[PDB]
């Protein structure tokens, strides 16, 4: 089954943002925040600016570690799963399920 | 002062089922355009629980080198699409979200 299951998303880019933390009926915390992402592309050999304000989740008790020292304009590298909604609009509610998280202006050390 | 390189990153890998059938035409300029939806579906797994990760992804292939990769896409084709997402308000709504294929893979090719 899991052939026609790949779904990874790597994406650098600035917390604009301020990150916000909710928790879940259930007690799960989540850490919420949205992330500005410019850059230049590689297209059919060409350059393409790509532009994006993607919204980003942090979801369990453990992965909350990967947040703690994210602010409005930490620059950082998210990797993790898309998962869209419906939102009554040709693709509208897209969001980063992140796994990882890396600080571009730091060398691992909080 | 320009950015760093490391901020540039967008990369993104999905499989999935095309759901809405291509659409090729070209622009004004020359440009030749080839447009459909992948509808994604996998399982995942966050705070140890258990979720589907589901997205009917807006895909584009643009530029003449990387068109003849897509002729033998219809829907219900089961294929990998990569490359980097972009989100501009061009067409409309500032949320849509369009993956530009940069390289896409047959995951069942018999026909």
Redesign the interface.
């Known amino acids: 089954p ?13 917390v604009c943002r301020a990150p916000l933390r909710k928790v879940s009926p259930s007690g ?1 915390p989540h850490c919420q925040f949205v992330l500005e ?10 350059h ?7 919204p980003v989740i942090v ?3 453990e ?1 909350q570690a990967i947040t703690h020292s994210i602010t409005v304009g930490s ?1 950082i ?1 998210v990797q993790g ?4 909604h419906k ?1 009554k ?6 969001v980063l ?1 992140a796994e990882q998280i890396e600080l ?1 202006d730091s060398v691992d050390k909080l």
């Open positions: 899991n052939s026609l299951m790949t779904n990874r998303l790597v994406l650098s880019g600035t799960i992402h410019r850059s230049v592309q590689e297209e059919a050999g060409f393409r600016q790509a532009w994006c304000q993607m979801s369990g008790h992965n620059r590298t799963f898309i998962s869209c939102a609009n040709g693709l509208s509610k897209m399920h571009i």
